[PDB]
Amino acid sequence: CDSYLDIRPVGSVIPQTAEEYRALLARAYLNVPNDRGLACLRSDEMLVNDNEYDRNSYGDIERWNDVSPFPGTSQFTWSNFYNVLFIANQVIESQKEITEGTPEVVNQLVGEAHLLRAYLHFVLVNLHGQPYTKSGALNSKSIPLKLDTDLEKTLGRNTVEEVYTSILSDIEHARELINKEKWETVFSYRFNVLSVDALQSRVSLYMGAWPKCLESAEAVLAKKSVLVDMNETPLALPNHFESVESITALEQVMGSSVNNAVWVPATFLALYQEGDKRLAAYFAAPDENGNRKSSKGGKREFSCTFRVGELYLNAAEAAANMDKLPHARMRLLELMRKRYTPEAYAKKENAVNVMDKNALISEILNERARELAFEGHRWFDLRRTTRPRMVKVLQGKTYILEQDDPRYTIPIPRDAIAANPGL
Amino acid sequence: KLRWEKTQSVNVGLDFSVLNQALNLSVDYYYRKGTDLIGKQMLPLETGFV
Secondary structure, X not given: OOOOOOOOOOOOOOOOEHHHHHHHHHHHHHOOOOHHHHHHHOOOOOEEOOOOHHHHHHHHHHOOOOOOOXXXXXXXXXXXXXXXXXXXXXXXXXXXXXXXXXXXXXHHHHHHHHHHHHHHHHHHHHHHOOOOOOOOOOOOEEEOOOOOOOOOOOOOOEEHHHHHHHHHHHHHHHHHHOOOXXXXXXXXXXXXXXXXXXXXXXXXXXXXXXXXHHHHHHHHHHHOOOOOOOOOOOOOOOOOOOOOOEEEOOOOOOOHHHHOOEEEOHHHHHHOOOOEHHHHHHEOOOXXXXXXXXXXXXXXHHOOOEEHHHHHHHHHHHHHHOOOHHHHHHHHHHHHHHHEOHHHHHHHHHHHOOOOHHHHHHHHHHHHHHHOOOOOOHHHXXXXXXXXXXXXXXXXXXXXXXXXXXXHOOOOOHHHHHHOOOO | OOOOOEEEXXXXXXXXXXXXXXXXXXXXXXXXXXXXXXXXXXXXXXXXXX
């Protein structure tokens, strides 16, 4: 005599309210995998320790050993990526059903979910997909896009163009939905409008869409351009979550285990010229071999996804790529003045102000490598920019990564293929 | 997409009575194949769960 079919089971927490969905999205934020540190382990800015346990896990990644790793080596976390993607899609599909929440709060939740989904897809297609700028890589299948919460279907790999179109669509949705200007310092891992614009700038930079990249970078800089001046505080890390430069502090790029197991090779330190406060601020005491450790990560308070220095570098690169040399030079020298000793800043200005297009672009790329050291940015910059031939000396052996090597794309993890043979 | 566990049944019967109910026979051959039975499956990793 009584029947409505609207009954919620009692005995477990079923997210229905805006606070419950905020808790779910916070758990999704926590489980964001830090696979950009492992990805940059594949680059030239890291050297695994001479130990055995510390090398049996990360040695094969550094050596570009895609075929026959040691089974004990570290693996990229496909499962965590797609679990956070599932939670984001659940939050997205739960709109128009979130109870006990202001529309400006539900809209912010859905926009955060959209931006998190876009960022996760971007990182996945960067890790396991060919670069957007590579010839013949636009129609190549890279990763399966997760756009629903279906548990009874097997997803096929989507092409890079499809993935980037979905990323741009999700960025636009987040821009339309996100309405928070700034979160608390303790809750700064969440996304805000500046996060939307910074993510759009980085995406357009990786696609090579220089106009939109410059537009988004300049929008961020107009809304916020305050940096940390290195000359008044030598030990002021720009990537610290409490710094005035961090926009989003979502992912601790460097895990404790990986940061405890690597050095900074002497070549990368030699790239740092005299007068750089980053040389004495980023890294620890020199080792007898000449390779220092790092102090930019390894603990939770060094979480950084976007920050204003990266926006300056993106703006400079876009301006240089669209022949807007004065703008690129202005941004690059602004960053250098914020970073360099003012004695060496004069020499840097004298050198940069006479640079042509190609030399200027190389200089911004070098400054980007210097600034974003140990932030999960060198490997992806190498993939998007030049794919240069790399020589790595390890334990008396030489390992060579050819120019435009097919090994610039990390293979899909073994567990992912085992669970989904169609990858 | 949770739903009921489907069962497809085919039954062939035969009733046969002789000699003023002196002998009654009822024979049934059945084939019931069940599908979509709710159970634990190892999902692909893209579903978000193992």
